[PDB]
Amino acid sequence: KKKKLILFDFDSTLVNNETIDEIAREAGVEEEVKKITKEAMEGKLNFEQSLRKRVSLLKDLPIEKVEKAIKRITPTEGAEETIKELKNRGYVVAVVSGGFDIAVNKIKEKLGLDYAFANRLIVKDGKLTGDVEGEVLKENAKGEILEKIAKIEGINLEDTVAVGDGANDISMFKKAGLKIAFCAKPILKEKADICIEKRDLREILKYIK
């Protein structure tokens, strides 16, 4: 009857991988970038500064190496089954990520998602420039996007569900009707209505609808 909306974070939630850490491996700086990613997700760094710092380390990386990394990204256990059941229960399904469109768009197309929002790696002459731009950078960014999607769809915020795992999902939780922390960092678990620790997205279904 009443339309419903579910938003998923991308890295480590809808997919197994951390996009930026996989690209960093191709640039020879996996260790270094992984450390910053962990600190950012734990809430110990400002997200935007942490993302720009990581992307700066990727300066000059060829697009072919970026694509090699992205091709390794795989959906989390239970992703397809969960998305299918959500659509059957009447949900609009969206993904919001502080990651990158070049990676997120592939999964949007593969999984048939209704909406996908992510940042953008800047490229020139077939190589990363070391810069990033986008609308999923500020602390309140994901929550603002949740509100925008719900408004387009005419969905009351009480009929929204957010599934997240890192510090940058806090604003998404703030605006959501039901807050699910999926194998998440402490800072987000403290804000959650439900904390799931089994790494299988199907585990959220019992709490849905």
Which chain residues interact with Mg ion by CB under 5 A? 9, 11-12, 165-166
- Residue 133's CB is within 10 A of a number of other CB atoms, namely 11
Looking at beta carbons only, is 134 or 166 nearer to Mg ion? 166
- Residue whose CB is less far from Mg ion, 66 or 96: 96
Q: Is 30 assigned to a binding site?
A: no
200 given a catalytic annotation: no
> CA-CA distances (angstroms) from residue 180 to 4, 22, 81, 191?
15, 26, 18, 9
11 is catalytic: yes
**Closest CB to Mg ion among residues 12, 171:** 12
18 is an annotated ligand-binding site residue: yes
Please report, as a single letter, which amino acid is at residue 68. Answer: K
175 contacts 190 by C-beta, under 8 angstroms: no
- Residue 9 Cβ vs Mg ion, minimum distance, rounded to whole Å: 4
For residue 129, count other CB atoms closer than 10 A to its CB.
16
Residue 52 marked as a ligand binder: no
Instruction: Give the phi and the psi of residue 128 in degrees, each rounded to 5.
Output: -65, 140
For the CB of residue 19, give the shortest distance to Mg ion in the complex, in Å.
10
Could you tell me how many helices (H) and strands (E) the chain has, helices first? 9, 7
Do the annotations mark residue 142 as ligand-binding? yes
Alpha-helix runs per DSSP H in the chain: 19-26, 30-41, 47-56, 63-70, 79-88, 101-111, 141-153, 170-175, 186-189
Q: Out of 9, 21, 159, 169, pick the active-site residue.
A: 9
**Which residues, 6+ apart, have CB-to-CB distance to 105 below 8 Å?**
116, 118
- Minimum distance from residue 131 beta carbon to Mg ion (Å): 22
Per the annotation, does 98 bind a ligand? yes
Nearer of residues 18 and 159 to Mg ion, judged by Cβ: 18
If the CB atoms of residues 15 and 66 are measured against Mg ion, the closer one turns out to be: 15
154 known member of a binding site: no
Q: How far is CA 128 from CA 23, 24, 31, 47, 67, in A?
A: 11, 12, 19, 20, 12
Binding-site residue positions = 9, 11, 18, 54, 97-98, 142, 165, 168
Kindly list the catalytic residues: 9, 11
Binding-site residue positions for Mg(2+) = 9, 11, 165
Binding-site residue positions for substrate = 18, 54, 97-98, 142, 168
